[PDB]
Each structure stands twice: as structure tokens, then as C-alpha cells.
């Protein structure tokens, strides 16, 4: 509620291996706080897959883990962060399907179709 976000576990990759906070942590069994990602306090969460996808107070659809189904290689993406969307009120994640809706009454969904 204060603003900071806790953490635990470790996501299973598309190739199929272990990663927690990019390359500074692999398996996070001990539950620890996650550092500053977006100044506005993160409202709700959005589980499913290895694809955790928070939502800022401003409405900045943030995103950690893989989200494979934006795109990259050689790690360095797990630990971040944004981006996409505009001012989404509901961030509603399934396994390999994402769901979003802009405060301007919009209905979006960007994943493995």
C-alpha cells in the first residue's frame, strides 16, 4: 500500500531457464522488496505465465519478466519496467494473453494470439 512492491520466486523462460532480477538474481526464494520502477505508486497487479505486468498510478502499463508470446536478447530486460498503453485502469493478465483498457474507454489485448 505504501508504494513499494514485494517479490518472490523466479520465472520460467521461453527457452526454459531460471531468472529473477535480470542477471543480479536467478532464484528469489527469500521474499524481498523490488526497487523504484515508476514514480507514481503501482495500483494493481496482473499475474499469468512468467509474465508479471504491474500498473502505475499515472496509468503507465509497466512490465517485468519476459512477456515473450517487447523483444530482445542476452537478458538485461528482467527488472524493468515499462512500456506501452496510455492510461490503463485495468491490467488483466492471463498466461500467454494480455489485457488492457485505457481510462479513455478503450479495450486492448497484446499477446500470443
Amino acid at each position: 500500500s505504501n508504494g513499494e512492491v514485494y517479490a518472490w520466486g523466479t520465472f520460467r523462460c521461453n527457452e526454459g531457464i531460471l531468472g529473477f532480477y535480470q542477471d543480479k538474481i536467478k532464484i528469489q526464494k527469500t521474499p524481498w522488496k523490488v526497487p523504484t520502477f515508476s514514480k507514481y505508486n503501482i495500483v494493481q497487479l496482473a499475474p499469468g505465465k512468467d509474465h508479471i505486468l504491474f500498473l502505475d498510478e499515472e496509468g503507465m502499463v509497466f512490465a517485468w519478466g519476459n512477456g515473450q508470446q517487447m523483444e530482445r536478447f542476452r537478458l538485461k530486460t528482467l527488472d524493468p519496467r515499462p512500456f506501452g498503453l496510455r492510461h490503463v485502469k485495468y491490467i488483466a493478465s492471463g498466461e500467454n494473453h494480455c489485457f488492457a483498457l485505457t481510462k479513455d474507454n478503450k479495450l486492448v489485448s497484446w499477446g500470443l494470439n
Binding site: 517487447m70 523483444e71 530482445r72
Partner: protein, 95 residues
Amino acid sequence: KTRKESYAIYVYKVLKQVHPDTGISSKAMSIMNSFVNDVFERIAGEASRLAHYNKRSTITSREIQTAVRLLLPGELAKHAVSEGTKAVTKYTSAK
């Protein structure tokens, strides 16, 4: 007004996939075209010569990658060597 076939659009498009917001500069959005320039170039000649010093009057993938490996640096090469492999397999598997 002769049509300047610039990688601008294409250079922009591939930005989106890697990063959605945003984001470039004018000076740099030229700098990109001169990363596409030097590669397309340097690649073609270790492709071209390859054909001459392996006696075949037509540049296949056979060469293009061989250069690609021979031209790209260590880990990067195997990567794009992989990404070619991919775009090689997908090109063959089309309708």
C-alpha cells in the same frame, strides 16, 4: 524530385519491435542509414570475392552467411547467423 529510397521507414519500423516508445533524432536517424550502409556494403564484398575465390558466378546464401560469419564479431555472428537460419527456414516454409 528523384525518389530517395532511404531506410528511414524500415529503420523506424525495426525500432518499434525492440522499443515501442519512442524514439530517435534526425542526426541519428541518418546514423542508422550509415550502419545499414556500411554493413550492406562490407557484407556484399566478402560475399562477392568469396564467389570469385570459390569460382561460382552467383551469390547464394552459401556465401552471404559465410561472409556474415566471417564478417560479424564473435557472439553477435552466431546470433545473426541464428536469425538468418530462422529467416532462411521461414522463407522456405512459405506458401
